Design an enzyme around this catalytic site. Structure first.
Site, PDB file in Angstrom:
ATOM      1  CG  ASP A   1       2.145  -6.222  12.807  1.00 22.01           C
ATOM      2  OD1 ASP A   1       1.517  -4.977  12.709  1.00 22.01           O
ATOM      3  OD2 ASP A   1       3.451  -6.168  12.161  1.00 22.01           O
TER       4      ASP A   1
ATOM      5  CG  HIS B   1       2.383  -2.891   9.987  1.00 22.30           C
ATOM      6  ND1 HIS B   1       2.967  -3.587  10.945  1.00 22.30           N
ATOM      7  CD2 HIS B   1       3.317  -2.449   9.328  1.00 22.30           C
ATOM      8  CE1 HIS B   1       4.369  -3.466  10.791  1.00 22.30           C
ATOM      9  NE2 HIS B   1       4.505  -2.665   9.908  1.00 22.30           N
TER      10      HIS B   1
ATOM     11  CG  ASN C   1      11.322   2.239   9.730  1.00 14.08           C
ATOM     12  OD1 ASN C   1      12.160   1.362   9.439  1.00 14.08           O
ATOM     13  ND2 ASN C   1       9.832   2.116   9.363  1.00 14.08           N
TER      14      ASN C   1
ATOM     15  CB  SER D   1       7.748  -3.022   9.734  1.00 11.36           C
ATOM     16  OG  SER D   1       7.869  -2.166  10.688  1.00 11.36           O
TER      17      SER D   1
END
Ligand code: CA
Ligand code: CA
Length: 279
Positions: free
Chosen positions: A39, A69, A161, A224
């Site tokens: 990530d 994130h 998404n 996520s």
């Protein structure tokens, strides 16, 4: 073990019904397993990680998580308060910049790095890789995820998404990995979550409280957030000897809560991650 007043997502994956607030889990807590978080990085100094997190690779100027994130996803994997596997080992691979973006060629390199780096770590119970990223379809990205899975790592990827079919997104459209959809606390498919026959499982993905940079916490939503739930559950189940990396995704689907979700399109599985814990 039982964590009272836990985040709703943790309480959901240890219950056959929604609405509970306690997270029931075995005390082993994924000890002996390792989870790579590919990530934006991990704020390894966060007290919630208890020194079980460390950065091993960055493809940018610094290994610091300047976004949050990656720290949020790692916290759902194995932070003390917000993690599924509260005793697992966390490795950070920074393939996304501090704006949350990254070229596919760097993402592919990060996956090939994990497939090799696992061979010089001590992870007797297994290795897991959590990828809360994606974009348009790419056969090279799908092949890199398949190589990582074939090398012996449980790969969990986000479905996306877009509220669309995940077959047009990578590495979500790779059949050999574990593609994860998102749900909310009322057992509804998250309004943003992708779907399709390529999805393997669903996880809590709406309003997920976890760690954040600066030694803080916050709640955000997305597939996520559902992926580290499945990644942490895999490491938790492999420590118990229940399953292996090659078959963890199938075991998780076989032992999931079936038919509990709503607004699931026809052709998409109605399966919710569940640890089957019994005191
Ligand atoms: Ca149920
Ligand atoms: Ca699959």
């Amino acid at each position: 073990a039982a964590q009272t007043n836990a985040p709703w997502g943790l309480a959901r994956i240890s219950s056959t019904s929604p609405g509970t607030s306690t997270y029931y889990y075995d005390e082993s807590a994924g000890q002996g397993s390792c989870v790579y978080v590919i990530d934006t990085g991990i704020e390894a100094s966060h007290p919630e990680f208890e020194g079980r997190a460390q950065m091993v690779k960055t493809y940018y100027y610094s290994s610091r998580d300047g976004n949050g994130h990656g720290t949020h996803c790692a916290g759902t994997v194995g932070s003390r308060t917000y993690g599924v596997a509260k005793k697992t080992q966390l490795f950070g691979v920074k393939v996304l910049d501090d704006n949350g973006s990254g070229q596919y060629s760097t993402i592919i390199a990060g996956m090939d790095f994990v497939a090799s780096d696992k061979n010089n770590r001590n992870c007797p119970k297994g290795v897991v890789a959590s990828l809360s990223l994606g974009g348009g379809y790419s056969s090279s990205v799908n092949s890199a995820a398949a190589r990582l899975q074939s090398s012996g790592v449980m790969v969990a990827v986000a479905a996306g998404n877009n509220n669309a079919d995940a077959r047009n997104y990578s590495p979500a459209s790779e059949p050999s990995v574990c593609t994860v959809g998102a749900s909310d606390r009322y057992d509804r498919r998250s309004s943003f979550s992708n779907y399709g026959s390529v999805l393997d499982i669903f996880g809590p993905g709406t309003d997920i409280l976890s760690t954040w940079i600066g030694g803080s916490t916050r709640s955000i939503s997305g597939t996520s957030m559902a992926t580290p739930h499945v990644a942490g559950l895999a490491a938790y189940l492999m420590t118990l000897g229940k399953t292996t990396a090659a078959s963890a995704c199938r075991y998780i689907a076989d032992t999931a809560n079936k038919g509990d979700l709503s607004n699931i399109p026809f052709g998409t599985v109605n399966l919710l991650a569940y640890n089957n814990y019994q005191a």
